Amino acid sequence: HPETLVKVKDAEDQLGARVGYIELDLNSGKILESFRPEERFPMMSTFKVLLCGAVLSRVDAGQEQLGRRIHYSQNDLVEYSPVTEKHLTDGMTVRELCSAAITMSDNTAANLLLTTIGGPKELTAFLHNMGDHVTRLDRWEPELNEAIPNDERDTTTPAAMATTLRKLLTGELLTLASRQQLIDWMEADKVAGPLLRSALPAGWFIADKSGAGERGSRGIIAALGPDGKPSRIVVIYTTGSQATMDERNRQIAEIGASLIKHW
Numbered sequence: 001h002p003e004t005l006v007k008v009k010d011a012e013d014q015l016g017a018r019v020g021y022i023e024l025d026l027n028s029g030k031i032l033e034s035f036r037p038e039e040r041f042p043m044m045s046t047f048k049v050l051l052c053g054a055v056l057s058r059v060d061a062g063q064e065q066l067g068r069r070i071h072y073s074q075n076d077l078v079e080y081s082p083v084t085e086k087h088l089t090d091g092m093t094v095r096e097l098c099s100a101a102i103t104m105s106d107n108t109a110a111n112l113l114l115t116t117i118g119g120p121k122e123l124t125a126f127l128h129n130m131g132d133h134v135t136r137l138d139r140w141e142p143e144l145n146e147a148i149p150n151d152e153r154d155t156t157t158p159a160a161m162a163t164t165l166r167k168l169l170t171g172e173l174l175t176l177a178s179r180q181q182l183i184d185w186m187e188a189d190k191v192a193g194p195l196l197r198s199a200l201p202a203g204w205f206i207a208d209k210s211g212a213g214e215r216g217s218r219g220i221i222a223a224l225g226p227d228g229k230p231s232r233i234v235v236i237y238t239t240g241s242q243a244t245m246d247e248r249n250r251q252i253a254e255i256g257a258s259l260i261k262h263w
């Protein structure tokens with residue numbers, strides 16, 4: 001609804017930053033509303049859904065097993081590795097790593113998983129091969145969050161990410177079982193999901209992944225809808241803001257309020 005683009009433009013004003021925004025009908029893929037839909041923004045931790053999709057594709061192709069245990073070391077650990085730092089001596093299974101990456105934004109977990117699939121070049125190839133010719137991963141954690149102005153490394157657009165998410169969750173790229181696992185991890189997000197869930201009416205379906213980088217960069221991807229079933233994909237990215245995290249959060253909240261009001 002255009003009233004929501006008013007909020008998105010309010011957000012650009014108050015944040016002093018570029019915001020990209022898109023809504024996609026989940027059934028058909030039609031674009032319902034968009035703002036800067038084909039401009040690039042850093043993916044940050046939102047890339048971890050695409051990563052675990054590529055991991056699931058391997059599982060489906062019998063090149064990977066979710067129960068396969070991955071070992072690592074103190075020097076593998078990068079910044080913000082809340083679950084992986086606890087399992088130095090245990091190791092973790094591929095499933096546990098994807099759960100840690102998506103639900104908790106664990107950076108080391110994402111790195112370990114990036115290794116299993118062939119790294120950023122292979123993730124990029126995976127995306128290209130399912131028809132996303134725009135999204136690119138180039139670096140590993142934590143450098144991929146650098147968000148240098150005008151740098152295309154490690155970016156998507158709201159349009160490319162929205163279409164990719166839809167195809168991941170509803171096309172035949174992944175098996176039914178793999179779609180359901182990937183959607184389970186996203187419904188279990190511990191970072192943004194609890195905030196979305198508390199704000200929205202009871203019974204609403206929410207599966208999401210968010211991210212934050214340097215330079216006020218942040219974003220989120222989401223499948224949501226009333227009555228326990230998603231009906232729309234929403235993608236929001238922003239970069240360049242010097243606003244406090246409070247101002248940044250309040251603007252996201254205003255955009256989400258309008259989304260629901262005009263559903």
Ligand SMILES: Clc1ccc(CN(Cc2ccc(Cl)cc2)c2nn[nH]n2)cc1
Nearest residue numbers: 191192210211212218219220236249252
């Ligand atoms: Cl309590 C709280 C938790 C997370 C945030 C910020 N978000 C959630 C967020 C980020 C971007 C968008 Cl657009 C929506 C939500 C974030 N995700 N990853 N790191 N931080 C703010 C308050």
Ligand SMILES: Clc1ccc(CN(Cc2ccc(Cl)cc2)c2nn[nH]n2)cc1
Nearest residue numbers: 192195196199234249252253255256257
């Ligand atoms: Cl940082 C951040 C995290 C979660 C929210 C969730 N929302 C609503 C919301 C719903 C859908 C989308 Cl796309 C964005 C925000 C909220 N409204 N009031 N307080 N929190 C907002 C900002």
